[PDB]
Design a protein around this ligand. Structure first.
Ligand code: NAP
Ligand code: OG7
Length: 181
């Protein structure tokens, strides 16, 4: 085998995710949870995969650019091939998903996004869960999360407190596709 593609995103009050090619906020604790959720595997020795658009890859600091302990797939029609063994450039979403499903040591595909990547994942058969961090307020984003029918999902009822860093408040949400749930 089973292979799950889980989308992971942090949206503001207007569903915005990005502003001026970068993120509208800095939340170290939320980013630490992101790294944990996208890195940990039930079977050690197996790895997780992160599939991202070109602009997300460019928004990752070059010192951390190949996301450690995770196999990196970058969708791009323009970038040259990446010589690194942990990064691979895929020219289409279907080819990227096929390449990931071929690799046996990949446990879970974490769609970390870009709007087009989020939409493609939302239409993928491997779609399992959405891990949505809902941030309060309007950060005047220029790039947004795709429109999505939450009626396709079941919202997990675990107790979710409010979190706050640097006066920025947010809360975690987990949705599971109704086909699986
Ligand atoms: N808050 C969050 O959780 C969050 C998450 C992700 C991103 N963001 C923000 O949002 C922005 C990045 O997202 P974005 O939507 O602007 O861009 P993106 O999807 O990250 O990157 C777009 C690029 O990816 C490539 N691409 C996408 N789908 C493809 C496909 N099916 N086949 C081939 N190539 C494909 C193309 O590369 P070429 O241009 O080379 O063809 C395209 O121009 C930044 O502002 C970032 O900080 C925020
Ligand atoms: N929720 C949610 N938040 C996001 O920021 C986001 C992004 C963009 C992004 C994704 C990852 C990083 C990054 O390098 N992060 C880390 C930070 C500290 C320690 C380790 C890591 C690591 O992963 O190694 C930065 C930016 C895509 N999708 C997202 N979803």
């Amino acid at each position: 085998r089973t292979l799950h593609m889980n989308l992971i995103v942090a949206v503001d009050g207007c569903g915005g995710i990005g502003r001026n090619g970068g993120m509208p906020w800095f939340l170290p604790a939320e980013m630490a949870r992101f790294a944990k959720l996208t890195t940990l595997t039930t079977d050690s020795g197996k790895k997780n995969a992160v599939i991202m658009g070109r602009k997300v890859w460019e928004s990752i600091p070059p010192k951390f650019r190949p996301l450690k302990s995770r196999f990196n797939v970058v969708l791009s029609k323009k970038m040259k091939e990446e010589s690194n063994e942990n990064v691979v450039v895929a020219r289409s979403f279907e080819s990227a998903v096929s390449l990931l499903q071929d690799m046996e040591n990949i446990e879970t595909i974490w769609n970390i996004g870009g709007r087009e990547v989020y939409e493609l994942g939302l239409n993928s058969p491997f779609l399992h869960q959405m891990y949505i961090t809902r941030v309060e307020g309007d950060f005047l984003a220029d790039v947004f999360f795709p429109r999505v029918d939450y009626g396709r999902f079941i919202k997990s009822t675990e107790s979710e407190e409010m979190h706050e860093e640097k006066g920025i408040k947010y809360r975690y949400e987990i949705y599971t596709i109704k086909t699986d749930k």
